[PDB]
């Protein structure tokens, strides 16, 4: 059914009190972190933890801006989760579940384990009623001017169901 999902406590997330996300979301936006990648769970948690602190301390967000992140370890990491507002895409933080692949994917795409985990996640969101059945899937760059989720990754998701052409 739903992939495992590594929680904030596991990667030692800082505590916050951020605005709630009203479910179900109408869109899914694919993003890459554009930073280092990670193929083992402990390396990925550290990466997630630093991102939360980067977003909070330098970008001044309320928390990590993603709802979830996916690692080349085939792991799905909880960003703010399903119930919190996001801080990933201008104008879509309250209606779009932001999912970031941990890594930089313009030249090379996430591995099979990552791509697979991402999809199982999306599937779960619909099944569970967190996403509308008719939801739209888009690339970060289709929405705003930004270098994400990277061409190689873009080419893959564009073949996904619901991808908005």
């Amino acid at each position: 059914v739903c992939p495992n999902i590594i929680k904030r406590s596991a990667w030692e997330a800082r505590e916050t009190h951020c605005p709630k996300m009203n479910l179900p979301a109408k869109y899914v936006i694919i993003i890459h972190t554009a930073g280092t990648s990670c193929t083992v769970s402990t390396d990925c948690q550290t990466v997630v933890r630093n991102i939360q602190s980067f977003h909070m301390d330098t970008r001044n967000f309320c928390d990590i801006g993603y709802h979830f992140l996916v690692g080349q370890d085939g792991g799905v990491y909880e960003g703010v989760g399903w119930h919190i507002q996001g801080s990933h895409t201008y104008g879509f933080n309250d209606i779009a579940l932001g999912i970031a692949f941990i890594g930089y994917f313009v030249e090379k795409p996430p591995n099979a384990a990552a791509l697979e985990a991402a999809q199982d996640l999306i599937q779960c969101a619909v099944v569970e009623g967190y996403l509308t059945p008719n939801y739209l899937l888009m690339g970060h760059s289709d929405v705003v001017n930004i270098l994400s989720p990277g061409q190689a990754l873009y080419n893959i998701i564009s073949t996904w169901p619901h991808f908005k052409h």
């Binding site: 993003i31 977003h55 970008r59 001044n60 967000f61 309320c62 801006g65 993603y66 801080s87 990933h88 895409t89 201008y90 104008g91 879509f92 933080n93 970060h140 929405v143 705003v144 001017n145 930004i146």
Partner: peptide, 5 residues
């Protein structure tokens, strides 16, 4: 990442 908007 792009808060608010």
């Amino acid at each position: 990442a792009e808060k608010x908007x």
